[PDB]
Write a protein that binds this ligand. Structure first.
Ligand SMILES: [Ca+2]
Ligand SMILES: [Ca+2]
Ligand code: NA
Lengths: 121, 121
């Protein structure tokens, strides 16, 4: 008994001194639009930090954190991965932004554009 | 040789089972729109968590964390206070969102409406 294990790479570069986020699938295709979850499963995000600003994941930020779609976020000790876990059958749509620390200053970094997850009914 | 110390309270209630953020000043008056930082100083945010979801600050998130407006962010060990510090003469405009943990689940909570800080030329 099992679900889907999806993978996205979180590519961050510095453009005019500010981070820019480009999301690619495992063979390098730019990700287009919503991620769909049809079953209990995981989405693994791998940080590829090209900024020199020592970026690390500290979590995934949600405006509707009790909406029941993603049920848990998991993070590797070194901040290089964060995973989203859907542990049940709750349908709907949710959005989120990545939250990262940096070693240049003490402000947290946020991805500007919300990622969308659609859990169909 | 000194600056200004501003105080806002972040009042979080649970509306329809998701958090809603109202900001109030020293006098308990609801405020909206931009904060001005017009010389090196501090903005202190107090948490008033009426959600029952054990919110605490873990930091402040910025899409453009290297723009020079806010130079540091401090946080109290109990997550009830965060402060934004301007330590230089950089004029410009920055935006941020509060980043909170909760005790219900492992998703981070974001305030949905970016607060603006304008530091005049
Ligand atoms: Ca779920
Ligand atoms: Ca500054
Ligand atoms: Na808990």
């Amino acid at each position: 008994p099992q679900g889907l294990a999806q993978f996205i790479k979180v590519n961050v570069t510095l453009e005019n001194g500010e981070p820019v986020f480009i999301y690619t699938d495992a063979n390098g295709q730019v990700c287009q639009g919503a991620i769909t979850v049809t079953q209990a499963g995981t989405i693994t995000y791998l940080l590829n930090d090209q900024t020199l600003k020592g970026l690390k994941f500290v979590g995934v930020g949600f405006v509707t954190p009790f909406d029941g779609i993603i049920d848990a976020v998991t993070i590797s000790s070194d901040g290089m991965l964060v995973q989203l876990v859907d542990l049940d059958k709750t349908p709907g749509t949710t959005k989120f932004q990545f939250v990262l620390s940096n070693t240049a200053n003490t402000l947290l970094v946020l991805s500007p554009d919300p990622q969308i997850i659609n859990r169909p009914q």
